[PDB]
Amino acid sequence: PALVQRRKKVAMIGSGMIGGTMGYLCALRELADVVLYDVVKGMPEGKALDLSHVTSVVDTNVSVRAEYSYEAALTGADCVIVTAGLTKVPGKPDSEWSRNDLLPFNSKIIREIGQNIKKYCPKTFIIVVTNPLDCMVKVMCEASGVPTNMICGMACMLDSGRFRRYVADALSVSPRDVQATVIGTHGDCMVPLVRYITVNGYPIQKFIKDGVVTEKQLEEIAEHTKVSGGEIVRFLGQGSAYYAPAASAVAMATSFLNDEKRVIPCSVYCNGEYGLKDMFIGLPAVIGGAGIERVIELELNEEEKKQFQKSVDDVMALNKAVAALQ
Amino acid sequence: PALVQRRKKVAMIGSGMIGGTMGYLCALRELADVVLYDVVKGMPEGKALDLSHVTSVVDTNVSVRAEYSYEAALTGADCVIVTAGLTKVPGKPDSEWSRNDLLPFNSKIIREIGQNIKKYCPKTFIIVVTNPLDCMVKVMCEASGVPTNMICGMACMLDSGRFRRYVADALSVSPRDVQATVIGTHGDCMVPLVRYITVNGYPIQKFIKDGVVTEKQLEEIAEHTKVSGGEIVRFLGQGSAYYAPAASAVAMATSFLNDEKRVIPCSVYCNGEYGLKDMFIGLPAVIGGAGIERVIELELNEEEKKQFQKSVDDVMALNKAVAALQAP
Amino acid sequence: PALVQRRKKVAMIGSGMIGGTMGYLCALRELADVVLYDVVKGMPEGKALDLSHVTSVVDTNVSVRAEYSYEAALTGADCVIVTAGLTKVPGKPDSEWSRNDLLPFNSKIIREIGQNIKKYCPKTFIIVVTNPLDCMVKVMCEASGVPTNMICGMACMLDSGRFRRYVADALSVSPRDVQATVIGTHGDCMVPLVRYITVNGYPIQKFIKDGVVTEKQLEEIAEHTKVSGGEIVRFLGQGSAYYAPAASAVAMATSFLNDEKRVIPCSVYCNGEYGLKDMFIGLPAVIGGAGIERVIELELNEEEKKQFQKSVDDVMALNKAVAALQ
Amino acid sequence: PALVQRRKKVAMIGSGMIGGTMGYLCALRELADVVLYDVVKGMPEGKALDLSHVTSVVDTNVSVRAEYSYEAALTGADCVIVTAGLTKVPGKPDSEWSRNDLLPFNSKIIREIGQNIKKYCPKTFIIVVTNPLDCMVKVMCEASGVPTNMICGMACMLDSGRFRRYVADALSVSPRDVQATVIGTHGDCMVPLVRYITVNGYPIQKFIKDGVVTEKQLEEIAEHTKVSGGEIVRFLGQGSAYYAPAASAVAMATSFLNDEKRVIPCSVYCNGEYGLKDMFIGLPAVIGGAGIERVIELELNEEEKKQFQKSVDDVMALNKAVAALQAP
Ligand SMILES: CC(=O)c1ccc[n+]([C@@H]2O[C@H](COP(=O)([O-])OP(=O)(O)OC[C@H]3O[C@@H](n4cnc5c(N)ncnc54)[C@H](O)[C@@H]3O)[C@@H](O)[C@H]2O)c1
Ligand SMILES: CC(=O)c1ccc[n+]([C@@H]2O[C@H](COP(=O)([O-])OP(=O)(O)OC[C@H]3O[C@@H](n4cnc5c(N)ncnc54)[C@H](O)[C@@H]3O)[C@@H](O)[C@H]2O)c1
Ligand SMILES: CC(=O)c1ccc[n+]([C@@H]2O[C@H](COP(=O)([O-])OP(=O)(O)OC[C@H]3O[C@@H](n4cnc5c(N)ncnc54)[C@H](O)[C@@H]3O)[C@@H](O)[C@H]2O)c1
Ligand SMILES: CC(=O)c1ccc[n+]([C@@H]2O[C@H](COP(=O)([O-])OP(=O)(O)OC[C@H]3O[C@@H](n4cnc5c(N)ncnc54)[C@H](O)[C@@H]3O)[C@@H](O)[C@H]2O)c1
Ligand SMILES: O=C([O-])C(=O)[O-]
Ligand SMILES: O=C([O-])C(=O)[O-]
Ligand SMILES: O=C([O-])C(=O)[O-]
C-alpha cells in the first residue's frame, strides 16, 4: 500500500575497489539500498549483481543497482560516498607514490560530482574518500553547496585504526579498547597523537612505566602509522588499500544514518579552530543525524603543534594549487 | 561421523532474572549451548523451552536445556556463570536495601557451588555475579580450587557501564566512545574514577574547559553511578537489575570464549597489585582465552587512593568475617 | 544543527515481562529509541534505567525511557507494540489456564490504547500481543481507526517458531532451515500445517520416506506445538512465555522498519480470504515498509479446512462476546 | 598463563579476490584468525595489513597474517578454503568463457595443495572453490586423503543464492524467505529446481495460479541463474564474481565451526545417492561440527532426472580425463 518506512539509500559515486566494498558492507548488514555509479560501463552492473546475490546468501534484503546517469544515481540519496578518481599517477614507480600528485587528475572529477549533487540531492550527507583527501573535500564543498556540517572526508578514522591495531598488538589487547587518534592532513604530514593514547581510558604512560611497551616502540608505531598507506601500495603492486577504507567510510555513514553520535576523527570544516577558516582538515568529530555536530580542538604539545602546522601548510598549499587550476 | 567442532557450553548456575537473560543473549547470538540450573524445579524448564523457541525466531542453532543435578549442569561447561542466591533480604524496606546484608544467605550457596565445580568442571572459567560480589568471588575461589586466573566477578563492567551512559548523555555522544571506569568493591564504596574519564581517549578535562560539562555535573554523575543499583531496586519494587548485569557477564564470557583480550574491569585475584594479596576486588583487567591474562594497576592520586582504601577495608573486613564464621 | 536522520522510535505500551524484553532487543541491536509505558509507576523507570545501562555495555546508542502519559509515550512512535494486560485469570488454577478467559479483563485496556493511538500517532504501525490475541487485534482495529494494512497481531510467528524448533530437533538441522507454519487462531484451535513443512524448500514427505522422522512423530510435534504456551505457563508457575514472544514481535517490527518484506505469519485483517471478512486471524503475510503488504491464502486439504474452521469459530465467538461487553 | 580457549583458524589458500574477501568476512565478524597464502609475493602481506586494520575500525580482534610456506599457512587450520587457481584462460574472449577450460590449468595446483593438507592439517574441513568445481573437489579429496565427510565444494549455495534473489525480486519478498535450490555440477548443466521453489514453505505453483508470476517468468529465472557466472564475467571485464562466492564459502565454514547443521547445497561425496559412487556433485546436505553430516536425496521427475543425468555425465567424463592425465 502506502510506503511508510523507506530504506535508507547510499549512492557510491565511483564503483572501484572501495565503492564495491562499501556496497558489500551495506548488503551484508542490510544498512541501506545501494546505487553503484562509475564512468566505466559494465563493471558496475557486474558488481551490483554479485552484491544482490550476497543478500540471498546472508539472508538480508536491500536493493543493489548500477546507474550510469548522475540523476538516477544521486536522486533520493541519504548519503553520497565519493571514491571516483585515480589512486596512482600513471607511469610513476611505487616508490614515488604520492597522494598529492593525484590533485591534477581528481580535482575536476570531484568538482563535477559536487555540481551534480547540488542539482540532484542538495540535502544529502556527503562523505569524500578521493585523494588528496582534505583538498578534495573543500573542492566538493564549494561545488556541492551543501551546509558545511553536511560534508566530511574519510581519512583519519583509517589512520587511527592503523595506529590502534599496532598499539593493540604491542599491548596484546583488543583494538576495541585502544583509543589512539591521528589528526591533520591525510598524508606524510599526518599527526599521530602518541600522547593521547589510552587503553580503555587508562593513560598509555602507565603502560610504559610498567614496561609493557617502550617509548621508542610507540614512536616507531607512530612512524609505521604515517607510512602504512604507502606500505600497502607497495605490497599490493596495483591500486591501494580498500578493506579498512571501506569499513571506515561506512562506519561514518552509519553514525550519520542511525544518529549514533560516534566520536570519529575525519576531515571537517574549520570554523576558527586553531585559527583555521574556510578549509577542511582532519580533526576528531561527532557524527550524528545532523551531520558533523562537534569538532574537538585538542590541546597540542610542542611537537604536535609543529607537526600539525606542517599538516596545515600541506593542505593550504594544495588548496592554493587547486585554485590555480580552476 | 565424529564431531570435530563442538559448540561452546555455558552453564547458568541459577536460572532467575539474570540467568535466564544471559541464556537469552547466548540464544540470540548463537554464542553457545546453554544449560539452566536452579534449586527451584519446573521454572528453568519453562525458560529453557521459551529460549529454545527463540533460536527458531532468530534463525540460530544452540541447544538450551534445563538440568537438575550439579553433575548434569556443570559437566563439560567451558564457562560457568553463577547467579544463584538472594537479591533482597526478606521483610526489609527497599530504602534499607544493602548488598552486604546478603552475606549470611549467599555464602553457603556460593561455597556449595564451588565444591561442585571442583568436582565436575575444574577446568572451567568461572564468572560470579551473586552479591555481595567481591566476597562471593573469594568464597567461590576457595571452594572451587580453580587457578586464580580462571575466576572473576562481574560488577565493575556494569558500574562502568552506568557511569558511561550518564557521561554519554551529558556529552551527547555514543557510550561506545566514553571510557569511564569504576574500581573497588561493588557497593557504596565503589570508586568512580572521574579524573580518568575519556571521550575516545580525549581527557574529560577538555570538555570541562570547553564548557560542555562541569566538575559538579561529573561528581553528581559519579554519585548516581554509586547509587544506581539501589535506585533500580526501589523503582522495580521486586528484585534488582538484570538486563545490563546479564549483558556484562556475557560480554566477559565472550571475551574469554573468543580470546578477544578485551580490557574489562572486574573483580580479580590480587597478588601484589595496589599492595593487595589473597583477595579479589574490582580492577581493570584483560580477559582472554587464558582467562584473566592481565591485572592493570592505575596510578591513583591521594584522594583516589583514599576512596579505594575504604573499598579495600570493606571487603577485607567482610572476608575475615566470612572466614571466621565458616563451617569446618 | 538541524536533525536530518532521526532514529526510529518504538513505544512499548505495557512494560511487563514482554515489553521489557522487546526494549532489551531494541537496545542490544541499536534498532530504535525506546519508550516504556505502563499503568504501574516506578517499575518502567527501573527497567528504562537498566536498559539504558545496556547500551553502554554493548556499545550502542539509543534512548530508552519511561513515560507515564499516553501523549508522551505515543507521540512520534513509528511502531507501537501493545502487551498491556493480564496473562492469567486471578485465582484460577494453572491447570485451567485459558487465553479466552482473559477477554473480560483485557478488552477495555486494548480499546483505550487504541483510542489514544488514534489521537497521538495515527500513522504508526500497531503490533498487538495482548491475549486473546486475534480478538484483541479486532478491538484495537475498531478503536484505533488506522489503515487495515497498518495493524496486526503477533502470535503465529511464535507458534511457528515452536513448530520449527521441534521439527529442527527431530531432523538434527538448524531451525533456520525449517519452514513450518501455524495459521488460525492463537489457541487450542491453532492449526500447525504439518503438510506444509519443508526443509530448505524440500518436502517433509521425503524425510519421512528416508526414515528421518515418522508421520506419527510429526503429528506429536503438531500437538506439542498447540500446547506449548500452557506447557510453559505450567513450568513457570507465574506468568507466561516472554523471550520468544518478544523476539517474534521485534522481528515483525524490524521487517516493517527496514522494509524487509519478510514472510511472517501473523494476525491480519481479512478482506475475503477463506470467506473471512471484517475480522483478524493468523495467516502468512508479507510485512514491509507499507505494513501488511500481502496476505497469503494457502490451499487447505480436508483435515486442514476442518481444523481451520474450528479456529475461525473460536475467534468469531470471541468477537461476538466482545461486542456484547462493549 | 595457559591458553584454554584458542580462536578458530581459517586458512585462505589463494589470496586473490575471493580469498581476500573471505578474510574480510572473518575480520568483520570476528569469526577466526586468518592466514592469507598465495604464490604471488607481497600481495598477501598488503591484504593482511589492510584486513588487520579493519579489526580496529569494526572493533573486533582476530589475527590476520600472510604466510608464504604451506606449513605456516596450513598448520593448526580448523578449516581450509581453497581458491588458488585461474579464473579465465588467457587470450580467450569473454564470450567464450567456460569453467571446464580451466581444468588443465588448475588440476595440478589443487592436487599439490591437497598433498600439503594431508601432511600439515589432516583433521581440517576442506572447502574447495576453484573451478571447475566438482572435478576439483574430487582431486582435492584424493590428494588430501581426508575423510569424505571432511571435504566439500562451494557452488550450489552461490547458484541457489542467485536463484533466490531473482525469485525474491519477482515476488517482492525477502530472499530469506525464498527456498530455491540448484543441484548438479556448477556449470551450464546445473539444475535450477523450479518445481521445488517455495516461499517460506509455500509452493511456487500457488503464486503462478494466483497470477503473481508466470511459467515463462520462472523459466527465465532458471535460465538467468545458469548464466549468472558468465554474465558477471562479461560485465566485469577482468576476473569473475567474488562477493557472493566469498559469503557462500564462509557461511559453509561457519556452519561447520559453530556446528549449526544448516542445510546447504554443496559439492559432496556420493555413496549411492541418485546411484552415484566415488565422485562429488552438488546436492543438498547438512553441514555441522562433523562436516557433511547428511546428504539429501530429492525425488526428481523425468525432466529433472534428464537434466541431472546430463550434469552427472559431464563431471564423470572430466573426472575420468583428469585421472588419465594426472602426474605420478
Ligand atoms: C583518504 C583515504 O584514507 C583513502 C584510502 C584509500 C584510497 N583513497 C582514495 O580513494 C579513491 C578510490 O580508491 P579505489 O576505489 O581503490 O580506486 P579504484 O579501484 O581505481 O576506483 C576508482 C573508481 O572511480 C572511477 N572513476 C574515475 N573517474 C570517475 C568519474 N568522473 N566519475 C565516477 N567514477 C569515476 C574509476 O573508473 C574507478 O572505478 C582513490 O582516489 C584513492 O587514492 C583514499
Ligand atoms: C555484581 C553485580 O553487578 C550484580 C547485579 C545484579 C544482581 N546481582 C546479584 O546476582 C544475584 C542474582 O540476581 P537475579 O538473577 O536477579 O536473582 P533471582 O531472580 O532471585 O534469581 C536467583 C536464582 O537463584 C536460585 N537459587 C537460590 N539458591 C540456589 C542454590 N543453592 N542453588 C542454585 N540456585 C539457587 C533462585 O531459586 C533463583 O532462581 C543476586 O545475588 C543479586 O544481588 C549482582
Ligand atoms: C499472542 C502470544 O503469543 C502471547 C505470548 C505471551 C504472552 N501474551 C500475552 O501478552 C500480554 C503480556 O504478557 P507479559 O508481558 O508477559 O505480562 P506481564 O508481565 O503481566 O505484563 C503485562 C503488563 O501490562 C501492564 N498493564 C495492565 N493494564 C495496563 C493498562 N491499562 N495500560 C498499560 N499497561 C497495563 C501490567 O501492569 C504489566 O506491566 C498478556 O496479555 C499475555 O497473555 C501473548
Ligand atoms: C564454484 C564457484 O561458485 C566459484 C565462483 C567464483 C569463482 N570460482 C573460482 O574460484 C577461483 C578463484 O577466483 P578469484 O579469487 O576471483 O581469482 P583470483 O583473484 O585470480 O585469485 C586466484 C589466486 O590464486 C593464486 N594462485 C595461483 N596458483 C596458486 C598456487 N599454486 N598456490 C596458491 N595460490 C595460487 C593466484 O596468484 C591468485 O592470487 C577461480 O578458479 C574461479 O573460477 C568458483
Ligand atoms: O590514502 C591511502 O591510499 C591510504 O592511506 O591507504
Ligand atoms: O548489585 C546490584 O544489584 C546492582 O548494582 O544492580
Ligand atoms: O499466548 C501464550 O501465552 C503463549 O502461547 O505463549
Ligand SMILES: O=C([O-])C(=O)[O-]
Ligand atoms: O563459477 C563462477 O565463476 C561463477 O559462477 O561465479
